[PDB]
């Protein structure tokens, strides 16, 4: 029973570091896509904790527009994004504490 996470507004050419320490298990980002294009979402899992990311287009908060796939410390996807507003959830699912670096290109 708590307030929703405060979404960090970013854009399609972003590199930003975050952390998921203790009870901070989810970070939310939002961005807009003006015209269809492939984008690249990559999260570097610096401490190798149990974390991932999922992405929703505003219009479908159930089916994922994309999701991260772990390749060593790189949790990535590259996919054609239709126009509109997106919500990106970077989150942990185990008891580890770690930092990460998010890129959107
Ligand atoms: Na955080
Ligand atoms: Na957070
Ligand atoms: Na690596």
Q: What gap in Å lies between CA 30 and CA 6, rounded to an integer?
A: 10
| Residue 86 backbone class (left: φ over 0; alpha: ψ -120 to 50; beta: rest) | beta
How many Å lie between the centroid of ligand 1 and the Cα of residue 20?
Answer: 5
- Residue-range domains of the chain with CATH: 1-105 (2.60.120.380)
Q: Which of 5, 24, 30, 46 is nearest to 92 (CA)?
A: 24
Per-position b or e across 29-68, b if 16+ CB within 10 A of its CB: bebebeeeeebebbbbbeeebebbbebbbeeeeeeebbeb
DSSP at 90 = E
Please name which ligand lies nearest the alpha carbon of 45.
Answer: 3
Please name which ligand lies nearest the alpha carbon of 42.
Answer: 3
How many Å lie between the centroid of ligand 3 and the Cα of residue 73?
Answer: 5
Please name which ligand lies nearest the alpha carbon of 27.
Answer: 2
Write out 1-34 in H/E/C secondary structure: CCCCCCCEECCCCEEEEEEECCCCCEEEEEEEEC
How many Å lie between the centroid of ligand 1 and the Cα of residue 33?
Answer: 24
Neighbouring CB atoms inside 10 A of 92's CB total: 20
Please name which ligand lies nearest the alpha carbon of 100.
Answer: 1
């Amino acid at each position: 029973n708590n307030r929703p996470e405060e979404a960090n507004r970013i854009g399609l050419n972003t590199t930003i570091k975050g952390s998921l320490i203790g009870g901070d298990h989810t970070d939310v980002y939002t961005f807009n896509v003006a015209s269809a294009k492939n984008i690249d979402i990559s999260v570097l899992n610096e401490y190798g904790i149990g974390m991932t990311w999922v992405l929703h287009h505003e219009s479908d908060m159930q089916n994922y527009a994309a999701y991260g796939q772990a390749n060593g410390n790189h949790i990535e996807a590259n996919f054609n994004a239709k126009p509109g507003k997106y919500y990106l959830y970077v989150y942990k699912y185990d008891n580890g504490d770690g930092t990460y670096e998010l890129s959107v290109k």
